[PDB]
Design a protein around this ligand. Structure first.
Ligand SMILES: Nc1ncnc2c1ncn2[C@@H]1O[C@H](CSCC[C@H](N)C(=O)O)[C@@H](O)[C@H]1O
Lengths: 76, 97, 105, 324, 95, 86, 94, 108, 81, 97
DNA sequence: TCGGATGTATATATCTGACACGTGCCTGGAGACTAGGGAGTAATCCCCTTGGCGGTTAAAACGCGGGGGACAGCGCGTACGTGCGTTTAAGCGGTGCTAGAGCTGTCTACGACCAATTGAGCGGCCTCGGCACCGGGATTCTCGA
DNA sequence: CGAGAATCCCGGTGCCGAGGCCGCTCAATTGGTCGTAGACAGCTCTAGCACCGCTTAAACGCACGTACGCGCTGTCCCCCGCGTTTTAACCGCCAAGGGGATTACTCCCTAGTCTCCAGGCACGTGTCAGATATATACATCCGA
């Protein structure tokens, strides 16, 4: 399984993801290969914020669901 | 047609203004000025007339000290008459702005 | 029992009131013993200096009543108090009568 | 009695005319209204040069009856032009610039009928009843192409004459507005109802708006701020509690939110670091809009409103620098 | 009905000690009142800064002496030093 | 008469001879013309400096009124101490 | 063994890193910044103390600090600093 | 029986709430010290320090340097408009002055 | 005891300070005038600093006493506490 | 025999002194001066070398600010060269003495 | 150099209303006793400061063309004084008047203060790397042409 | 514009402070209490606040006219630029030494509580120092 994110930089990010991987796991991966604090990283999955209590397969996120890097700013 | 030379009518009443010292500023247009320039910081600011007289005294002495040092600027420029570049010089040296 | 600790120090400025302002003023934890005494003494000496300079202008202008003009000429015509109070302004008095050199024809 | 040009109900006027002050009260106002009718389609200046002269005595009911009956004959002439094989009037057309300036001054006179108790208000709170001219708002409307989607919000509408200016100017769908102080909110209701009747009386379109009597702390306004892009308030006398709360409200918004301020929420030369991730200037572009600029306002200096425009590309290039 | 604690009678007594046959206007009285509060607050803040600068909690006469020798012009300062020295001496001898 | 209690033009109230009057207080033999406008600007900036402070004192004391004490403390923070009022 | 003297050095470190990730400071500049912040601290503390003196209080609150900030800083500097304090006291409140 | 949090993180900040509160007590400023007062004051110092080190790092990158020396602090102070007006009565060691050339001394 | 040290402020040193301040051309009496002004300024500061050091009942001048005297001068040099 | 005109050797090294900024004052004769002028206020005053360097920095910046305003005095006098009456003017306007 | 002619102090009748002097009272200021803790001193111990010797040397001091600013006057036109009609708004002094400022009675938030609890925060140890520095060489004014 | 005179910069070499990490306080932080401080109702009252008569000094303009500002011009002289010749500056080394931080250890000084008390501040008073109208000599200016 591999999904994507269409950033507002337009970086189609390669996401080393698995259905065992959580939402926070992918957020830390975006921190890894993006340098971004994961405090804000909403990803548009059919117009839903994804939550770290669930995983990718808990939302049943289909592969190549090209998400969108939304910034729910939590410097706050 | 008796008329004095200039400098006379300067120095007489320079003496009178240095001696007879009350406000030498019409306090009603001054007070309207103070009310206007305070109105922009905040609307509806009641004053004390004592406070506005204090402002008049403060601004009076402030501009007089500025005038004296500005006169020193013009004298040091070997100029009898004061031009506002003297004022800008004096405010620069005093370090207002 | 009238005591008047300023006069017990031989003075005129109040011990208890200055001690009140020191305790109110948060200047330290504690107020020392001779501190308001010495403070009131220095205040009394400075004020005596000021009024001694004011009475001279009172003599100068045939006035039995000290005015802001007297105070103004007293402060400005001093040397050291002028240096002390150069950043200090007195209302109602005016300035020194002062004419510059090259304005007189 | 001055009709809408489609033969509708006349704007009935009292004798004597409503005195508001001595300098440019409602006597000169009706005359200038028909001077804008001279600035309309010219079939009345032929009668307006005749006996509607500048020389006339004070309280000239003669000139009032002349002015009203010449205007009624002018509307009858335009109706004789219309009622052949000709369409009467396109409805949705808009008033022009100085016409709408007259319209806002007209609503101010005929609605604000007590500036005295408007002056008599409460101490320090964002209740500071300072207003803006027609002209900076007009240039700001020129600066921000408010679409049918880009609506307007005036939280703290005052009397909302600015919102009416935006409504009669742009092609917007709706507008918002709310108010906290009671006397100008009641007079704002007067402004609302009168101005809607006024744009009936001109037969021209004004866009929709919601002026309210309430607050901004509610989550309703959070949602509505997140909806509507273009926002302004004269925030200059509000206090940095309220203004920072409104920054926090603006955080949840969409990109390119063309938000104008009076006192700015960020410097016009703002730069990002890692500290200001909580702050609000990172996600927006902070530019100065043009003042009057001939402005003996409250301030003798010009007013100089300030546009904020949402842009998170700054922070995403900052993320690229965090990669670097 | 209220209290605005001026120092006017102190000025009265000192004026009758130094120039007994002259008076004062109340405007001049307020000028001298502001003068006395100015000198008091300057010396008091000077001594408070000294107390913080030398890690101690009790401002005493030596501290006020240092504050005077800092804050005033020097010859008049030594005069006021001697005045307060003899005055605190009179406080000790007549405790 | 009346409308909103708005003052718009009072810089001329520091009049041409009054500036000259204060210059003769300052002991000036002869004055150029631009001294008038320049001095009006300087006094306006100085009054901005003081009146912001006094208004801020009123806001913190939560009054509506400018006392003399506010002015004295304002000039105290200016480093130009005035007496005669507190 | 030395006595644990106060400094602001780790906080200047935190501020320095959080404004710029790989920017250093000379130790002379460290002592300069420490003296600077102590100066600004003493100025605002003294002005708030004079304000509480001028309105007869016993407890300086953030109201007085806000007012002395508005008194001492010039312009937009104050306009942002008060908002920084607003955010921070708001975060500390809950 | 909860664990100790920290007031700077409770303020969500970086500057020491406890140290500023201790200095406000030991500074002899009022008899008592408010709760939000040292929080607000630490925020004010945070903004001032951030603002001056922004321009310090700006000058340092202008000289392409990493360890900020007093020169860049000096230039950061006297090059900014509002900061110099804040710090006109302020002298910083080891910085020297601005590049300040009076243009009338320049030749033709 | 010492001597001649006000002339220890040298003609190049005053020249170097002048060339820092933006002085194009110096006159001859500038040197002695600047020495006198420096001497007055230094007496005003150093007398205060000695007052601090003696008030601490210490014999050794710290940097902090100079800092406090410059705080009295409205100058407040940093780098030292 | 290459020699520059005057004003060149002014402005070059005006640039170098405004950029390269360390002390520009020989601190050993300066330090002996400070020890002498402090010796008269009190004999046997030990220093800190840090304190004397602080004095050097303070006096450096003080005289440089005096020089800058004095240069403004001479420019306002329409004089390229500075005479000590400019210094006396600047100290009078600043109000030192 | 002094006539004419000024607004310049000096002098004196007539208010007057600000200013020195009781007053009374009450309300902040002066002693008796605690105590405990800042602070003064005894001791000491390290450590920074002073002082000196010596080696280098940058840097300061005379000096000498020279060249550029200082400076003395002129004259010319300009703007800045001046009495004087005019004109114009300003001050003094009546009216109510009301909005805002000062005093009071809770009282409840709300921060001093002590005591567990510990973890952020500072003294000190490698370290290494931005920077000090040096040396070479490309690059840029320059000032007599 | 071209030889010279620095000057910018590039790169190599090393180095000594920053700076990350290590141990170990003690000061922050939690969690309590406990008095009390300003905070808000709630109230009197006074003091700016318009307003206008109503006089009135004074500002505003204006023809004159004149002292000054300044562009300019010799001039001169004195600082400047670079050179040569001293000279402490300065850097490091040795060595004492006294002085500033420390612990220790009482001690006595002031905070605080209580209680008397008297003197400072409204308050009210007379009252007389000076303000002002009117006349009267005079330092200075216009000018012959
Ligand atoms: N949180 C809030 N909710 C609603 N109105 C508010 C508000 N905060 C302030 N206001 C109101 O906003 C008004 C601003 S006065 C502005 C006048 C008018 N809008 C104009 O400029 O033309 C004030 O009267 C105040 O009562």
């Amino acid at each position: 399984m591999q999904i994507f994110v269409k950033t507002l930089t337009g970086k189609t990010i390669t996401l080393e993801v698995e259905p065992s991987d959580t939402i926070e796991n992918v957020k830390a991966k975006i921190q890894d290969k993006e340098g971004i604090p994961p405090d804000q990283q909403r990803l548009i999955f059919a117009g839903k914020q994804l939550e770290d209590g669930r995983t990718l397969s808990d939302y049943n996120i289909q592969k190549e669901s090209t998400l969108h890097l939304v910034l729910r700013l939590r410097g706050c | 047609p008796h008329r004095y030379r200039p400098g006379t009518v300067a120095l007489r009443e320079i003496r009178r203004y240095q001696k007879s010292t009350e406000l030498l500023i019409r306090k009603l247009p001054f007070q309207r000025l103070v009310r206007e320039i305070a109105q922009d910081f905040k609307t509806d600011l009641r004053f004390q007339s004592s406070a506005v007289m204090a402002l008049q005294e403060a601004s009076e002495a402030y501009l007089v000290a500025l005038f004296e040092d500005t006169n020193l600027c013009a004298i040091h420029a070997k100029r009898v008459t004061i031009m506002p570049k003297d004022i800008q010089l004096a405010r620069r040296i005093r370090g207002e702005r | 029992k009238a005591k008047t600790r300023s006069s017990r120090a031989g003075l005129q400025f109040p011990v208890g009131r200055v001690h009140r302002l020191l305790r109110k003023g948060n200047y330290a934890e504690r107020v020392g013993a001779g501190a308001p005494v010495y403070l009131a003494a220095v205040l009394e000496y400075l004020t005596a200096e000021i009024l001694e300079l004011a009475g001279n202008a009172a003599r100068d202008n045939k006035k039995t009543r000290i005015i802001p003009r007297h105070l103004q000429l007293a402060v400005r015509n001093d040397e050291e108090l002028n240096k002390l109070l150069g950043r200090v302004t007195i209302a109602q008095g005016g300035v020194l009568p002062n004419i510059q050199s090259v304005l007189l024809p | 009695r001055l009709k809408s040009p489609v033969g509708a109900e006349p704007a009935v006027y009292p004798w004597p005319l409503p005195v508001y002050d001595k300098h440019h009260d409602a006597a000169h106002e009706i005359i200038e209204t028909i001077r804008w009718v001279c600035e309309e389609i010219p079939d009345l200046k032929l009668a307006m040069e005749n006996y509607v002269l500048i020389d006339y005595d004070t309280k000239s009911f003669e000139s009032m009856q002349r002015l009203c009956d010449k205007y009624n004959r002018a509307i009858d002439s335009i109706h004789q032009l219309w009622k052949g094989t000709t369409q009467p009037m396109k409805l949705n057309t808009r008033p022009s610039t100085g016409l709408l300036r007259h319209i806002l001054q007209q609503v101010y006179n005929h609605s604000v009928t007590d500036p005295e108790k408007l002056n008599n208000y409460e101490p320090f709170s964002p209740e500071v009843y300072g207003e803006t001219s027609f002209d900076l708002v007009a240039q700001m409307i020129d600066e921000i192409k408010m679409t049918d989607d880009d609506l307007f919000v005036d939280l703290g509408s005052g009397v909302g004459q600015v919102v009416l200016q935006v409504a009669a100017a742009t092609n917007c769908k709706h507008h918002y507005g709310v108010e906290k102080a009671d006397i100008p909110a009641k007079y704002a209701e007067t402004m609302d109802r009168e101005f809607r009747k006024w744009m009936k009386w001109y037969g021209k379109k004004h866009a929709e708006y919601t002026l309210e009597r309430g607050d901004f702390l509610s989550e309703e306004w959070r949602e509505r701020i997140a909806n509507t892009s273009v926002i302004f308030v004269n925030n200059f006398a509000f206090g940095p509690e309220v203004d920072h709360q409104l920054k926090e409200r603006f955080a949840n918004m969409k990109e390119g939110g063309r938000i104008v301020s009076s006192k700015p929420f960020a410097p016009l030369n703002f730069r990002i670091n890692s500290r200001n991730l909580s702050d609000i200037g990172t996600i927006m572009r902070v530019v100065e809009l043009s003042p009057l600029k001939g402005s003996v306002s409250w301030t003798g200096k010009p007013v100089s409103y300030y546009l904020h425009t949402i842009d998170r590309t700054i922070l995403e290039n900052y993320f690229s620098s965090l990669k670097n | 009905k209220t209290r605005k604690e001026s120092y006017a009678i102190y000025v009265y007594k000192v004026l009758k000690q130094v120039h007994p046959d002259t008076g004062i206007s109340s405007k001049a009285m307020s000028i001298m009142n502001s003068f006395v509060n100015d000198v008091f607050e300057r010396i008091a803040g000077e001594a408070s800064r000294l107390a913080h600068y030398n890690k101690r909690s009790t401002i005493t006469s030596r501290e006020i002496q240092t504050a005077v020798r800092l804050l005033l012009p020097g010859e008049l300062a030594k005069h006021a030093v001697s005045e307060g020295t003899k005055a605190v001496t009179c406080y000790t001898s007549a405790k | 008469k009346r409308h909103r209690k708005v003052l718009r033009d009072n810089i001329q109230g520091i009049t041409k001879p009054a500036i000259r009057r204060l210059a003769r207080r300052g002991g000036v033999k002869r004055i150029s013309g631009l001294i008038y406008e320049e001095t009006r600007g300087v006094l306006k900036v100085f009054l901005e400096n003081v009146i912001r402070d006094a208004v801020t004192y009123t806001e913190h004391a939560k009054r509506k009124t400018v006392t003399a004490m506010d002015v004295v403390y304002a000039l105290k923070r200016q480093g130009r101490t005035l007496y005669g009022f507190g």
